[model samples]
Target: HMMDMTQQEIFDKQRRLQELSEKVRTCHQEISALRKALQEKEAEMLQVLEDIQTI
Candidate 1:
């Protein structure tokens, strides 16, 4: 499930990351945005990282 992943899976992962890759120039706002964004994607997000690493 590392680099041996599928093409669609890789693209999909990037798409998910692209959504969070933001720039507001405010640390607090950025973190708040991410906290909410993370909550928004919690289910799928956890799934992807379940076998990856610790929180």
Candidate 2:
């Protein structure tokens, strides 16, 4: 149902943030690499938020 839709979306991003956070902590990449990945993540998350708004 739609109930699960909302919950799953929230949970999906929750785990994604945790994984990304851990990845940044575990391995030290160059500054540009970090910025690049972070920027991409922000774009993806922003799109997800827009979808939620549309729903």
Candidate 3:
């Protein structure tokens, strides 16, 4: 049936969207984690710079 074909297509698109949404969510979390780690490293580098300046 033609309606059945349309339904199948819609379902496929919905599934793909769900997959992409999950991927985006994962990437967002990864970006946040990387940013946090970078900030920590920056702080450590600043501390080292201060020590060097004092010396």
List lDDT for all candidates, in order: 0.75, 0.88, 0.96
- Candidate 2, 12: how far from true, in Å? 53
Evaluate model 3: give its TM-score. Answer: 0.78
1-55 in candidate 3: lDDT tens per residue? 4558879899889999999999999999999999999999999999999999999
- Clash count for each candidate, listed in order shown: 0, 0, 0
Every model's TM-score: 0.32, 0.47, 0.78
Better candidate by lDDT, 1 or 2: 2
Q: Candidate 2: where are CA atoms >4 Å away? A: 1-29
For candidate 1, report its TM-score: 0.32
Off by over 4 Å in 3: 1-3
C-alpha lDDT (0 to 100) for residue 22 of candidate 2: 86
- Cα distance off (Å), candidate 2, residue 44: 0.3
lDDT accuracy of residue 28 in candidate 2: 57
Leading candidate by lDDT = 3
For residues 1-55, what per-residue lDDT tens digits would candidate 2 score against the true structure? 4548889999889989999998886665666688999999999999999999999
